[PDB]
């Protein structure tokens, strides 16, 4: 019934970005803030819990919807396939993934990974009591592949996920991707930056 | 003696949900509160310890009660078979499983997993001192499988397990499963939500 | 010299209890209190460090004292053989094993495992200042095997291991194994319960 | 298209330093301070988050730019190749690597590893309030390979990475490599030492 | 050039103590105090960071200095060879190894392991303010092997490694090995006990 798995992994090396030369693997990135845990005004850091949304197309993982019974989509362990090496640029703590590390794959080869993470970032929380509000920037981006290899494209930033209570309230979330040439390598480097603004409830 | 193990694992890939098409693996879910550890009124979080009761039928794991001596049920490591990818939609800390990660299996193929977990959840503990009491919702649910693949069915919520002493006392536990829709993915995702109400003893 | 190891592991699956049908593997259990670290009167929990003493007979692990030079007993990693799945039924934290995870095995097949553990238990430490003293019960027991598969038999509780200083002093340690029956299995269940009584030194 | 990976790992044992005899593997070391988290004046320790810049040449990892399509550089998991066993001599906590553990490799065989680390060091933070400033020395160095096997060569210390805000401000960063001697062995052990001086903003 | 590794591991099982019968593997043990982090007078525990010096002779790991080019000594991961199962008897926290887990081996077969560890011990720190000073005993010893299998021999205790500043100052370090005849089995158990005395600087 599911010899599909045996086949999908057969000739697969997850350390290889599935590019079809000059055809950069495009990954649709998106972050959804769930809650702001703490704010260390003393050391300038915020504890955040978010919901990463990543989707890309792995040509190595497609199959004939017919050659296999009624197998539309399968559930695979991220440790089995290639997954975007996105990293938090201003992080000061290792990311702690809260949810099961599993991804969904199409019969056509479309992967979807939605981990819930709690991670701490370096940020200026000076004006977290002022009505103006403290602003934190969460910069994400590939850690090794450039624009031609891995193309980052941000999608609709969902904010309806934020906790209703919570000691803090969201004043605004921006999100904007930028490509920077970096002094070297003819190839640019993309990155999505979520700008979160919040203030203590009073 | 027990060549049963060698056989049960022979052609098994634990990353594959044991469905036989138009036959969704039904898992009987149930949570039993053991004790409320702490309540962070400052950050709005509760530390809870409970033990989850999960049971399902794995057709790949059945055997002839005769072909094998007097082997009625075996004790296998969850890392060896498929196990429901249930997750706490609203958790803010990785689950810490306290008990041995072993499951029991019938000669017919009925698995049973009863782990004791300590995990922290985001919750509004404002009125934990009021006689009305603070209410927390623990939402659980499959993470990659929809209704047709994995059917969640809640069973009798046991409450006789709660610690007699404890700084807190249980005012009420509800528990109710709902089939909810999410953007994308044609199918809907079943989730069981345990609503716990407690107040500080005084 | 030691092809003994290559042979002892050859046809071994550590997930299989060494029962030779109608011959329940009997494990001699025993706990030795080393020190009481802390007592959280606010949340009702004790931090304990104890010395577990477990011994059983693995028929799969015996050899001819002659066929092998002068190899009387070997030192093997618990991850290599079957080991009792005993669990603390009243624990609120994963057990932290302090010592090397190695076991000793006889030429006849008698295993011995003595790990030092620090674990926290839920307990009523209300009267820890009273001269009467607070009493904690540490209930241990298999997690999946019943009486016919794994027979728990408690042996002499050693108390001479307790720390002379320490903020607390031992008023008494009981220890008593009990078997029961429940709704199911027609299968009984063994469990050893160490009852520790202590009070703050003043 | 990337059978390159299958080939690069084929005859590779990452526990073997890629010295091509009498030609010591030279690794270009460099640290970049990102932020000083806390200073424990009571126990004399600093919590630091730095950027580590390491680059070396692995002759075992080179390939014909032509024999392989347009594969210029690949992204490999440090657990797959040999990587400098540099250690922090005066660390009092295990290093916590924040970024993805991946390295970049040239078609010629030049590896590049840039991990972001948060680690705590033993240091005299007495005068952290004085205008003179507290000074900490972060001594790094290979731990098992001597001068002839692994040659450490420090490069330009980048300081533009430091956090603008932060409770502390950098008064000076030195950095100087020294070839020293030890009471364990008969051989020179090189080591780069970054001397950071900072004071609390007031 | 280094097929030496492929050969050194070929017929090796690291769970087997390398005793060439009637020849107890003698390990030269030695501890060097680096710094005393904290002292919990409330719970009677000290946080210590030391430097373990262990050396022994593994006959299975020797080679012809000629049969292999100019390979004098190699750097191997402790997970690859047998290493003394020494344990901290009165430890109340798992040992946290700070340095790279690698060992050095002679062409003759002499292993050397020098890990830096931070571990907490149960100790009477009552008089840490008195001029007399608090005294802590760090008892180490094999966990499964007795005198005939593993012979512990302490060597010069180096104290020049202690941190100059530090809230505490060393009043004295003794170190003395004792052979402790336990219950049964005529072969006793050797254990080295480092007695450290310190007082708060004032
Ligand atoms: C995808 O699978 C279908 C069904 O197996 C393949 O169809 C074959 O060709 C025609 C069109 O359906 C049928 O008459 C044959 O009977 C099918 N052959 C088989 C093996 O049943 C189709 O060719 C496949 N296409 C791809 C992309 O591989
Ligand atoms: C899955 O593949 C389908 C093609 O059938 C495509 O419409 C979609 O973009 C992919 N994602 C889904 C529907 O989850
Ligand atoms: C099932 O058990 C029967 C009991 O009579 C026995 O003959 C045989 O081993 C098994 N038969 C099949 C087809 O599974
Ligand atoms: C186990 O198998 C038996 C076989 O008759 C079945 O009746 C029962 O519902 C299954 N569940 C358990 C764990 O008892
Ligand atoms: C034990 O080993 C000896 C070899 O000295 C052999 O003669 C004898 O048959 C063996 N007996 C058993 C119990 O296997
Ligand atoms: C081996 O088991 C026998 C059981 O009779 C016992 O006498 C002997 O002391 C044991 N050896 C050990 C565990 O040291
Ligand atoms: C690389 O491969 C080409 C194949 O066209 C071959 O001609 C050439 O000798 C190789 N170049 C080097 C650097 O050896
Ligand atoms: C690899 O790095 C070296 C460093 O000098 C550089 O010269 C070379 O161009 C890089 N790779 C190749 C062969 O292009
Ligand atoms: C050592 O190596 C030499 C030359 O390879 C050869 O005589 C023999 O293999 C070895 N002899 C001894 C005594 O180790």
Phi, psi (deg, nearest 5) at residue E67: -50, -20
Q: Of D111, D14, D106, D113, which Cα lies nearest the Cα of D68?
A: D106
Calculate how close chain A gets to B157, using CA atoms only, in Å: 24
Buried b / exposed e over B59-72, threshold 16 CB at 10 Å, is ebbebeeeebeebe
Distance from C-alpha of A75 to C-alpha of A104, rounded to nearest angstrom: 5
Is E167–D126 a contact, with Cβ atoms under 8 angstroms apart? no
Closest in C20, C93, C126 to B98, CB measured: C93
Rounded Cα distance, C160 and A31, in Å: 58
Residue keyed to tokens 């609709």: A156
CA atoms within 13 A on the CB side of D151: 10
Other C-beta atoms within 10 Å of C85: how many?
19
**Nearest alpha carbon to residue C41 among C146, C154, C136:** C136
- Indicate the SS3 state at residue C170: strand
| C9 φ, ψ (degrees, to nearest 5) | -90, -25
- E7, E135 in Cβ contact below 8 A? no
Q: Which residues pair with D142 in a beta bridge?
A: D86
Beta bridge partners of C119: C48
Q: How far is CA B23 from CA A173, B12, B84, in A?
A: 43, 19, 16
C133: its two tokens: 């003293």
Question: How many Cβ atoms are within 10 Å of D92's Cβ, its own excluded?
Answer: 24
Nearest protein Cα to ligand 7, atom 12: D64
Distance from CA of D10 to the nearest CA of E (A): 14
Contact B191, B177 (CB under 8 A): yes
Q: With contacts defined as CB-CB under 8 Å, which chain D residues touch A16?
A: 2, 5, 74
Q: Backbone phi, then psi, for E200, in 5-degree steps?
A: -70, 135
For A81, residues 6+ apart whose C-beta sits below 8 A from its C-beta are A12, A14, A58, A61, A103, A105, A111
Cα C20–C26–C27 angle (5° rounding)? 135
Nearest to E5 among D16, D124, D126 (CB): D16
Alpha-carbon radius of gyration of chain A: 19
**CA D80 – CA A16 distance, rounded (Å):** 13
Contact D13 E1 (CB under 8 A): no
* Cβ distance of B165 and C16 shorter than 8 Å: no
The full 3-state SS of D11-70, as one line of letters, equals: CCCCCCCCCCCCCCEEEEEEEEEEEEEEEECCCCEEEEEEEEEEEEECHHHCCCCCCCCC
> Which residues are CB-neighbours of B164 under 8 A, at least 6 positions away?
C124
Q: Is E169 exposed, middle or buried (0-12, 13-18, 19+ CB in 10 A)?
A: middle
Closest CA to D160 of D31, D30, D28, D32: D32
Closest residue in A to D99 (Cα) is A87
Q: CA E43, CA E121: separation in Å to the nearest integer?
A: 11
Distance separating alpha carbons of residues C33 and C45, to the nearest angstrom: 16
Residue C163: CB partners within 8 Å, gap ≥ 6?
C34, C35, E44, E122
Against chain D, the chains showing at least 3 CB pairs within 8 Å are A, E
Distance CA(B12)–CA(B4), nearest Å, equals 13
Does D contact E via 3+ CB–CB distances below 8 Å?
A: yes
DSSP labels, chain E: ---HHHHHHHT--TTS----SS-PEEEEEEEEEEEEEEEETTTTEEEEEEEEEEEEE-GGG---TTTSSS---EEEETTTS----EEETTBSS--EE-S--EEEE-SS-EEEE--EEEEEEE---TTSSSSS-EEEEEEEEESS--TTTEEEEE-----TTS-SSSSEEEEEE--EEEEE--SSSSS-EEEEEEEEEEEE--
Query: Distance (Å, rounded) from C-alpha C113 to C-alpha A13?
Result: 41
CB B196 within 8 A of CB B138: yes
Tokens of A123: 């940020």
Pairing type for strands E74-77 and E116-122 reads unpaired
Count CB neighbours of D50 within 10 A: 22
Q: How many of the other CB atoms lie within 10 Å of CB of A120?
A: 23
Determine whether the interchain pair E92/C6 forms a contact, defined as Cβ–Cβ distance below 8 Å: no
- Decide the pairing of beta strands D110-113 and D86-88: unpaired
**Interatomic CA distance for residues B126 and A167, integer angstroms:** 11
Q: Could you tell me which of A87, A2, A90 has the C-alpha nearest to residue A45? A: A90
Please report how many Cα atoms fall inside a 13 Å half-sphere around the Cα of residue D62, on the Cβ side: 10
Asked if residue D12 lies in contact with residue D31, where contact means CB atoms within 8 angstroms, the answer is no
Element (H, E) at C8: helix C4-10
Q: Are the C-beta atoms of residues B133 and B197 closer than 8 Å to each other? A: yes
Nearest by CB to residue E85, choosing from C1, C100, C166, is C100
**Buried/exposed C128-137: b ≥16 CB within 10 Å, e otherwise:** beeeebbbbe
DSSP string covering E44-102: TEEEEEEEEEEEEE-GGG---TTTSSS---EEEETTTS----EEETTBSS--EE-S--E
Kindly compute the dihedral angle of the four CA atoms of residues B153, B158, B159, B163, in this order, to the nearest 10 degrees. -120
Q: Pick from E102, A153, E9, B102: which is nearest to D86 by CA?
A: E102
Q: What is the DSSP string of B108-161?
A: S-EEEE--EEEEEEE---TTSSSSS-EEEEEEEE-SS--TTTEEEEE-----TT
Q: Tell me how crowded residue E24 is: count the other CB atoms within 10 A of its CB.
A: 19
Containing B7, the helix (H) or strand (E) segment is helix B4-10
Tell me the Ramachandran region of residue E89: left when phi exceeds 0, alpha when psi lies from -120 to 50, beta otherwise: alpha
Please identify which residue in the block is written with the tokens 């062995």: D185
Using DSSP bridges, classify how beta strands A53-57 and A25-30 pair: parallel, antiparallel or unpaired: antiparallel
Tell me how close the Cα of B78 comes to any Cα of chain C, in angstroms. 11
DSSP β-bridge partners for residue E106: none
CB contact under 8 A, C116 and E42: no
Report how far apart, in Å, the C-alpha atoms of E67 and of each of D18, E76, E109, E192, E194 are: 20, 19, 15, 39, 43
Distance CA A184, CA C143 (A): 59
In whole angstroms, what is the distance from residue A23 CA to residue E7 CA? 45
Across the interface, whether the CB atoms of D17 and E75 are under 8 A apart is answered: yes
**HEC assignment per residue over chain A:** CCCHHHHHHHCCCCCCCCCCCCCCEEEEEECCEEEEEEEECCCCEEEEEEECEEEEECHHHCCCCCCCCCCCCEEEECCCCCCCCEEECCECCCCEECCCCEEEECCCCEEEECCEEEEEEECCCCCCCCCCCEEEEEEEEECCCCCCCEEEEECCCCCCCCCCCCCEEEEEECCEEEEECCCCCCCCEEEEEEEEEEEECC
- Burial of A24-40, coded b for 16+ CB within 10 Å and e otherwise, reads bbebbbbbbbbbbbbbe
Handedness of CA B88, B94, B100, B101 (dihedral sign): positive
Cα A126 vs. chain centroid, distance in angstroms? Answer: 27
Cα–chain-centroid distance for residue E149? 17
What distance lies between CA C43 and its chain's CA centroid? 26
Q: Which of C4, C67, C107 to mutate to test the pocket of ligand 5 (most atoms within 8 A of CB)?
A: C67
Nearest in space to E199 (alpha carbons), one of E164, E169, E166, E167? E169
Whether A165 sits inside 8 A of B124 (CB atoms) is: yes
- For strand A96-97 and strand A116-122, is the pairing parallel, antiparallel, or unpaired? antiparallel
The experimental resolution of this structure, in angstroms, equals 3.1
Query: Which pairing describes strands A176-180 and A189-200: parallel, antiparallel, or unpaired?
Result: antiparallel
Residues within 6 Å of ligand 8 by CB:
D 106-108, 110
Pairwise CA distance, residues B102 & B113, whole Å: 7
- Which three-class secondary structure state does DSSP give residue C7? helix
Q: What is the dihedral of CA B4, B6, B11, B14, to 10 degrees?
A: 90
* Order of strands, sheet of A33-40, starting from the edge strand that comes earlier in the sequence: A33-40, A45-51, A116-122, A96-97
Compute the residue count for chain A: 202
Residue of E4, E2, A15, A59 lying closest to D8 (CA atoms)? A15
Contacts of E23 (CB under 8 A, 6+ apart): none
DSSP chain D: ---HHHHHHHT--TTS----SSSPEEEEEEEEEEEEEEEETTTTEEEEEEEEEEEEE-GGG---TTTSSS---EEEETTTS----EEETTBSS--EE-S--EEEE-SS-EEEE--EEEEEEE---TTSSSSS-EEEEEEEEESS--TTTEEEEE-----TTS-SSSSEEEEEE--EEEEE--TT-SS-EEEEEEEEEEEE--
Q: How far apart are CA E137 and CA E139, in angstroms?
A: 6
Beta partners for A103? A76
Going by C-alpha positions, the residue among E104, E57, E96 that lies closest to residue E78 is E104
- CA separation for the pair A138, A31 (Å, rounded): 10
**Which residues of chain C form beta strands (DSSP E)?**
25-40, 45-57, 74-77, 87-88, 96-97, 102-105, 110-113, 116-122, 134-141, 150-154, 168-173, 176-180, 189-200
Nearest Cα to Cα of residue C198 among C111, C142, C121, C145 = C121
Counted residue by residue, chain C has a size of 202
Residues near C184 by beta carbon (within 8 Å), at least 6 away in sequence: none
Number of other residues whose CB lies within 10 A of the CB of residue C100: 18
What helix, strand, coil percent values describe chain C, rounded to 5? 5, 45, 50
> Which domains are assigned to chain C?
1-202 (2.70.170.10)
Token couple for B119: 């995990």
Among chain E residues, the shortest Cα distance to D183 is held by E158
Give the separation between CA A74 and CA A111, rounded to whole angstroms: 10
Kind of pairing between the strands at E150-154 and E25-40: parallel
Which residues, in sequence order, are CB contacts of C18 under 8 Å at separation 6+? C25, C56, C57, C58, C59, C60, C82
Q: What is the C-alpha to C-alpha distance for residues A154 and A162, in angstroms, rounded to an integer?
A: 19
What residues of chain B lie within 8 A of the CB of C145, using their CB?
75
- Residue B63 near residue B86, CB atoms below 8 Å: no
CB E82 within 8 A of CB E58: yes
Scanning the structure block, which residue is given the tokens 């055997």? B63
Cα separation, C157 vs D123, whole angstroms: 46
Q: Which residues of D32-47 are buried (b: 16+ CB within 10 A; e: fewer)?
A: bbbbbbbbeeebbbbb
Q: Residue B20 has which token pair?
A: 């036989």
- Sign of the alpha-carbon dihedral angle for E60, E61, E66, E68: positive
How many Å lie between the centroid of ligand 3 and the Cα of residue B71? 14
Whole-number Å distance between alpha carbons of A196 and A172: 6
Q: Are E40 and E87 in contact (CB under 8 A)?
A: no
Look up tokens 């010899």; give the residue.
Answer: A3
A120, A45 in Cβ contact below 8 A? yes
Phi first, then psi, for residue B6 (nearest 5°) are -50, -35
The Cα–Cα gap between E76 and C129 comes to 54
Residue in E163, E167, E159, E158 with CA at minimum distance from that of residue E134: E167
Determine whether the shortest distance from the Cβ of B183 to ligand 2 is under 6 A: no
Contact D/C (≥3 CB pairs under 8 Å): no
Q: For C24, which DSSP code?
A: P
CB burial readout D119-136, b (16+ within 10 A) else e: bbbbbbbeebeeeebbbb
Q: Per DSSP, what are the bridge partners of residue E113?
A: E54
Question: What is the least distance, in Å, from the CA of D182 to any CA of chain A?
Answer: 35
DSSP-assigned letter for residue B5 = H
Residue E71 CA: distances (Å) to CA of A29, C182, D20, D188, E6: 50, 67, 12, 17, 14
Nearest bound ligand to the CA of residue C109: 6
Contact A169, A198 (CB under 8 A): yes
Please tell me the residue having the least CA distance from ligand 3 atom 5. B66
Structure tokens at D198: 């900072």
**CA B65 distance to own-chain centroid:** 29
CA distance D61 to chain E (A): 15
């Amino acid at each position: 019934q599911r010899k599909l798995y045996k086949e999908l992994v057969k000739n697969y090396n997850p350390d290889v970005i599935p590019t079809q030369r000059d055809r950069p693997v495009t990954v649709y990135f998106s972050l959804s803030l769930l809650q702001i845990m703490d704010v260390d005004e003393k050391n300038q850091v915020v504890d955040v819990v978010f919901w990463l949304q990543m989707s890309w197309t792995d040509h190595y993982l497609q199959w004939n919807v017919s050659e296999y019974p009624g197998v539309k989509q399968v559930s695979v362990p991220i440790s089995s396939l290639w997954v975007p090496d996105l990293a938090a640029y201003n992080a000061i703590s290792k990311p702690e993934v809260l949810t099961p590390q599993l991804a969904l794959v199409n019969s056509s080869g479309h992967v979807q990974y939605l981990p819930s993470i709690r991670q701490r970032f370096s940020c200026d929380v000076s004006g977290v009591d002022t009505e103006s509000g403290a602003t934190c920037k969460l910069k994400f981006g590939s850690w090794t592949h450039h624009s031609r290899e891995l193309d980052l494209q941000m999608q609709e930033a969902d904010i309806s996920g934020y906790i209703p209570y919570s000691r803090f309230e969201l004043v605004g979330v921006t999100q904007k991707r930028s490509e920077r040439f970096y002094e070297c390598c003819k190839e640019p480097y993309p990155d999505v930056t979520f700008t979160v603004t919040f203030r203590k409830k009073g």
